[PDB]
Amino acid sequence: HWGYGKHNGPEHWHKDFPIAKGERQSPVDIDTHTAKYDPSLKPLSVSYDQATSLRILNNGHAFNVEFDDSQDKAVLKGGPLDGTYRLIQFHFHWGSLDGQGSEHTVDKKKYAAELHLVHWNTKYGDFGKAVQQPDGLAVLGIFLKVGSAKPGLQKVVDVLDSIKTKGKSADFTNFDPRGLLPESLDYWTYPGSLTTPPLLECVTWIVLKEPISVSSEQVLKFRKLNFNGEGEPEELMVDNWRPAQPLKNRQIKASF
Ligand SMILES: Cc1ncc([N+](=O)[O-])n1CCOS(N)(=O)=O
Numbered sequence: 031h032w033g034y035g036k037h038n039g040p041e042h043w044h045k046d047f048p049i050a051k052g053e054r055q056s057p058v059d060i061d062t063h064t065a066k067y068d069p070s071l072k073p074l075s076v077s078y079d080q081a082t083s084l085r086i087l088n089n090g091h092a093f094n095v096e097f098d099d100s101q102d103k104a105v106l107k108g109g110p111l112d113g114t115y116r117l118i119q120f121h122f123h124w125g126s127l128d129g130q131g132s133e134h135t136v137d138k139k140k141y142a143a144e145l146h147l148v149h150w151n152t153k154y155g156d157f158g159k160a161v162q163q164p165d166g167l168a169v170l171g172i173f174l175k176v177g178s179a180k181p182g183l184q185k186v187v188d189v190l191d192s193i194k195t196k197g198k199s200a201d202f203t204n205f206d207p208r209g210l211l212p213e214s215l216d217y218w219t220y221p222g223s224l225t226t227p228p229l230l231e232c233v234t235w236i237v238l239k240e241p242i243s244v245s246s247e248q249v250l251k252f253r254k255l256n257f258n259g260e261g262e263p264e265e266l267m268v269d270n271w272r273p274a275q276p277l278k279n280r281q282i283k284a285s286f
Pocket residue numbers: 119121146148169223224225226227228229
Protein backbone atom coordinates (compact mmCIF):
# COMPACT_ATOMS: atom_id res chain seq x y z
CA HIS A 31 0.00 0.00 0.00
CA TRP A 32 2.83 2.39 0.82
CA GLY A 33 4.48 4.60 -1.73
CA TYR A 34 5.74 8.13 -2.31
CA GLY A 35 2.44 9.75 -3.31
CA LYS A 36 0.41 12.36 -1.45
CA HIS A 37 -1.81 9.71 0.05
CA ASN A 38 0.60 6.88 0.81
CA GLY A 39 3.94 8.69 1.16
CA PRO A 40 6.45 8.95 4.03
CA GLU A 41 4.12 10.89 6.34
CA HIS A 42 1.66 7.97 6.18
CA TRP A 43 4.05 5.07 6.72
CA HIS A 44 3.80 5.07 10.50
CA LYS A 45 0.21 3.77 10.37
CA ASP A 46 1.23 0.39 8.90
CA PHE A 47 4.83 0.55 10.26
CA PRO A 48 4.93 2.20 13.70
CA ILE A 49 8.70 1.84 13.81
CA ALA A 50 8.67 4.84 11.41
CA LYS A 51 8.73 7.02 14.54
CA GLY A 52 11.44 4.90 16.13
CA GLU A 53 14.68 5.75 17.88
CA ARG A 54 17.08 5.07 15.04
CA GLN A 55 15.33 5.93 11.79
CA SER A 56 17.01 6.84 8.49
CA PRO A 57 17.80 8.90 6.60
CA VAL A 58 19.20 11.82 8.60
CA ASP A 59 20.73 15.18 7.98
CA ILE A 60 24.51 14.96 8.36
CA ASP A 61 25.63 18.07 10.21
CA THR A 62 29.29 18.17 9.20
CA HIS A 63 30.36 20.44 12.01
CA THR A 64 28.79 18.21 14.70
CA ALA A 65 29.97 14.83 13.36
CA LYS A 66 33.01 13.80 15.32
CA TYR A 67 36.21 12.44 13.87
CA ASP A 68 36.80 8.98 15.32
CA PRO A 69 40.53 8.11 14.93
CA SER A 70 39.71 4.54 15.96
CA LEU A 71 37.57 3.90 12.85
CA LYS A 72 39.39 1.53 10.45
CA PRO A 73 39.74 2.22 6.74
CA LEU A 74 36.76 0.91 4.83
CA SER A 75 37.42 -2.27 2.80
CA VAL A 76 35.35 -2.58 -0.39
CA SER A 77 36.23 -5.80 -2.24
CA TYR A 78 34.09 -5.99 -5.35
CA ASP A 79 36.57 -7.62 -7.78
CA GLN A 80 34.55 -10.87 -7.80
CA ALA A 81 31.07 -9.34 -7.77
CA THR A 82 28.52 -11.27 -9.84
CA SER A 83 25.48 -9.29 -10.90
CA LEU A 84 22.47 -11.21 -12.11
CA ARG A 85 19.47 -9.11 -12.86
CA ILE A 86 17.87 -5.71 -12.70
CA LEU A 87 14.34 -5.26 -11.43
CA ASN A 88 11.77 -2.46 -11.24
CA ASN A 89 9.95 -3.22 -7.96
CA GLY A 90 7.52 -0.34 -8.10
CA HIS A 91 9.59 1.97 -5.91
CA ALA A 92 13.10 1.83 -7.42
CA PHE A 93 15.17 -0.41 -9.70
CA ASN A 94 17.40 -2.97 -8.06
CA VAL A 95 20.57 -4.45 -9.51
CA GLU A 96 20.83 -7.84 -7.73
CA PHE A 97 23.95 -9.89 -7.14
CA ASP A 98 24.64 -13.54 -6.42
CA ASP A 99 25.32 -13.52 -2.69
CA SER A 100 25.56 -17.32 -2.23
CA GLN A 101 29.35 -17.05 -1.70
CA ASP A 102 31.71 -14.38 -0.38
CA LYS A 103 32.37 -12.59 -3.68
CA ALA A 104 31.64 -8.90 -3.09
CA VAL A 105 32.17 -7.86 0.51
CA LEU A 106 32.36 -4.77 2.66
CA LYS A 107 34.33 -4.86 5.91
CA GLY A 108 36.45 -2.58 8.05
CA GLY A 109 35.31 0.94 8.79
CA PRO A 110 32.91 0.76 11.77
CA LEU A 111 32.02 -2.83 10.96
CA ASP A 112 32.83 -5.99 12.85
CA GLY A 113 32.85 -8.96 10.53
CA THR A 114 32.06 -9.31 6.85
CA TYR A 115 29.05 -8.02 4.99
CA ARG A 116 28.07 -9.42 1.61
CA LEU A 117 26.63 -7.33 -1.27
CA ILE A 118 23.11 -8.38 -2.21
CA GLN A 119 21.92 -5.46 -4.38
CA PHE A 120 22.15 -1.75 -5.07
CA HIS A 121 19.52 0.80 -6.04
CA PHE A 122 19.02 4.55 -6.14
CA HIS A 123 16.64 7.24 -4.88
CA TRP A 124 16.26 10.35 -7.05
CA GLY A 125 14.20 13.45 -7.59
CA SER A 126 11.89 15.09 -10.12
CA LEU A 127 14.48 17.91 -10.33
CA ASP A 128 18.26 18.09 -9.85
CA GLY A 129 17.73 20.09 -6.64
CA GLN A 130 16.41 17.11 -4.69
CA GLY A 131 16.49 13.33 -4.69
CA SER A 132 18.92 12.21 -2.00
CA GLU A 133 17.71 10.72 1.30
CA HIS A 134 20.62 11.77 3.50
CA THR A 135 21.45 15.47 3.39
CA VAL A 136 24.75 17.23 4.24
CA ASP A 137 24.25 20.43 6.24
CA LYS A 138 20.69 20.32 4.80
CA LYS A 139 22.00 20.13 1.23
CA LYS A 140 20.02 17.68 -0.95
CA TYR A 141 21.85 15.93 -3.82
CA ALA A 142 20.22 14.93 -7.11
CA ALA A 143 20.23 11.26 -6.12
CA GLU A 144 21.70 8.70 -3.75
CA LEU A 145 23.04 5.22 -4.48
CA HIS A 146 22.63 2.51 -1.85
CA LEU A 147 24.84 -0.63 -1.99
CA VAL A 148 23.15 -3.03 0.45
CA HIS A 149 25.16 -5.69 2.30
CA TRP A 150 24.20 -8.25 4.95
CA ASN A 151 26.26 -9.55 7.88
CA THR A 152 27.45 -13.06 7.04
CA LYS A 153 27.22 -14.15 10.68
CA TYR A 154 23.41 -14.27 10.20
CA GLY A 155 23.42 -16.72 7.29
CA ASP A 156 21.15 -14.78 4.98
CA PHE A 157 19.46 -11.50 4.30
CA GLY A 158 16.10 -12.43 5.80
CA LYS A 159 17.66 -13.27 9.18
CA ALA A 160 20.08 -10.33 9.05
CA VAL A 161 17.31 -7.71 8.85
CA GLN A 162 16.00 -8.89 12.21
CA GLN A 163 19.33 -7.93 13.86
CA PRO A 164 20.55 -4.51 15.00
CA ASP A 165 23.84 -5.02 13.11
CA GLY A 166 22.39 -7.10 10.31
CA LEU A 167 23.00 -4.79 7.38
CA ALA A 168 25.63 -2.31 6.17
CA VAL A 169 24.45 0.09 3.48
CA LEU A 170 27.06 2.17 1.63
CA GLY A 171 25.46 5.43 0.45
CA ILE A 172 26.99 7.53 -2.32
CA PHE A 173 25.62 10.91 -3.36
CA LEU A 174 25.11 11.80 -7.01
CA LYS A 175 25.40 15.33 -8.39
CA VAL A 176 24.70 16.34 -11.99
CA GLY A 177 27.75 17.34 -14.03
CA SER A 178 29.98 15.07 -16.08
CA ALA A 179 28.69 11.63 -16.97
CA LYS A 180 29.70 8.57 -14.93
CA PRO A 181 30.95 6.08 -17.59
CA GLY A 182 30.43 3.17 -15.20
CA LEU A 183 26.74 3.96 -14.82
CA GLN A 184 25.86 3.90 -18.50
CA LYS A 185 25.18 0.18 -18.76
CA VAL A 186 22.53 0.66 -16.07
CA VAL A 187 21.01 3.68 -17.82
CA ASP A 188 20.80 1.80 -21.07
CA VAL A 189 18.90 -1.20 -19.71
CA LEU A 190 16.17 0.91 -18.04
CA ASP A 191 14.08 0.98 -21.24
CA SER A 192 13.49 -2.75 -20.68
CA ILE A 193 12.17 -2.50 -17.12
CA LYS A 194 10.01 0.58 -17.44
CA THR A 195 7.17 -0.62 -15.21
CA LYS A 196 6.61 -2.35 -11.88
CA GLY A 197 7.43 -6.05 -11.91
CA LYS A 198 9.59 -6.00 -15.03
CA SER A 199 13.07 -7.52 -14.78
CA ALA A 200 15.97 -8.14 -17.15
CA ASP A 201 19.14 -10.18 -17.21
CA PHE A 202 22.00 -8.00 -16.01
CA THR A 203 25.22 -9.90 -15.76
CA ASN A 204 28.83 -8.81 -15.53
CA PHE A 205 28.07 -5.31 -14.27
CA ASP A 206 31.00 -4.01 -12.18
CA PRO A 207 29.85 -1.93 -9.19
CA ARG A 208 33.41 -0.55 -8.75
CA GLY A 209 32.51 1.77 -11.62
CA LEU A 210 30.06 3.65 -9.36
CA LEU A 211 32.54 4.56 -6.58
CA PRO A 212 34.10 7.99 -6.09
CA GLU A 213 37.90 8.30 -5.63
CA SER A 214 37.86 8.79 -1.88
CA LEU A 215 36.38 6.39 0.66
CA ASP A 216 36.19 9.02 3.48
CA TYR A 217 32.82 8.59 5.20
CA TRP A 218 30.32 9.41 7.96
CA THR A 219 28.74 6.51 9.89
CA TYR A 220 25.78 6.13 12.27
CA PRO A 221 23.29 3.43 13.34
CA GLY A 222 20.01 3.58 11.45
CA SER A 223 17.31 1.81 9.50
CA LEU A 224 16.01 0.74 6.14
CA THR A 225 14.56 3.92 4.57
CA THR A 226 11.50 2.23 3.07
CA PRO A 227 8.91 0.07 4.85
CA PRO A 228 9.36 -2.19 6.86
CA LEU A 229 11.83 0.48 8.12
CA LEU A 230 13.67 -2.12 10.24
CA GLU A 231 16.40 -0.69 12.53
CA CYS A 232 19.08 -3.08 11.34
CA VAL A 233 21.44 -0.83 9.36
CA THR A 234 24.91 0.50 9.98
CA TRP A 235 24.97 3.43 7.56
CA ILE A 236 28.26 4.33 5.88
CA VAL A 237 27.81 7.47 3.76
CA LEU A 238 30.70 8.63 1.56
CA LYS A 239 31.72 12.26 1.70
CA GLU A 240 32.64 12.44 -1.99
CA PRO A 241 29.73 12.39 -4.42
CA ILE A 242 30.01 10.94 -7.89
CA SER A 243 28.99 13.05 -10.89
CA VAL A 244 26.43 11.79 -13.42
CA SER A 245 25.14 13.60 -16.51
CA SER A 246 21.79 15.31 -16.83
CA GLU A 247 21.00 12.71 -19.55
CA GLN A 248 21.78 9.83 -17.21
CA VAL A 249 19.52 11.03 -14.36
CA LEU A 250 16.91 12.08 -16.91
CA LYS A 251 16.57 8.42 -17.91
CA PHE A 252 15.93 7.43 -14.26
CA ARG A 253 12.99 9.82 -14.33
CA LYS A 254 11.36 8.03 -17.29
CA LEU A 255 10.79 4.89 -15.24
CA ASN A 256 7.26 4.18 -13.91
CA PHE A 257 5.96 3.38 -10.38
CA ASN A 258 2.92 1.75 -12.00
CA GLY A 259 2.71 -1.61 -13.70
CA GLU A 260 2.24 -2.05 -17.43
CA GLY A 261 -1.27 -1.21 -18.58
CA GLU A 262 -1.91 1.19 -15.68
CA PRO A 263 -2.01 5.02 -15.80
CA GLU A 264 1.54 6.29 -16.00
CA GLU A 265 3.00 7.83 -12.88
CA LEU A 266 6.67 8.68 -13.35
CA MET A 267 9.11 7.15 -10.84
CA VAL A 268 10.55 10.36 -9.32
CA ASP A 269 11.02 11.63 -5.77
CA ASN A 270 11.23 8.10 -4.33
CA TRP A 271 13.17 9.41 -1.33
CA ARG A 272 12.25 9.60 2.35
CA PRO A 273 13.08 12.95 4.01
CA ALA A 274 15.53 13.30 6.89
CA GLN A 275 14.35 11.87 10.24
CA PRO A 276 15.09 12.97 13.86
CA LEU A 277 18.64 12.11 14.91
CA LYS A 278 17.43 11.55 18.46
CA ASN A 279 19.99 9.82 20.62
CA ARG A 280 22.72 9.25 18.03
CA GLN A 281 26.16 10.60 17.11
CA ILE A 282 27.39 10.59 13.52
CA LYS A 283 31.11 9.73 13.37
CA ALA A 284 33.50 10.81 10.61
CA SER A 285 36.42 8.70 9.34
CA PHE A 286 38.27 11.87 8.48
C1 LIG B 1 13.00 -2.71 2.27
C2 LIG B 1 14.25 -3.26 1.72
N1 LIG B 1 14.75 -4.43 2.07
C3 LIG B 1 15.91 -4.56 1.40
C4 LIG B 1 16.13 -3.45 0.63
N2 LIG B 1 17.19 -3.24 -0.27
O1 LIG B 1 18.07 -4.09 -0.32
O2 LIG B 1 17.15 -2.29 -1.05
N3 LIG B 1 15.06 -2.60 0.84
C5 LIG B 1 14.81 -1.27 0.27
C6 LIG B 1 15.19 -0.15 1.17
O3 LIG B 1 16.63 -0.24 1.39
S1 LIG B 1 17.43 1.02 1.88
N4 LIG B 1 16.84 2.31 1.15
O4 LIG B 1 17.14 1.14 3.28
O5 LIG B 1 18.78 0.83 1.46
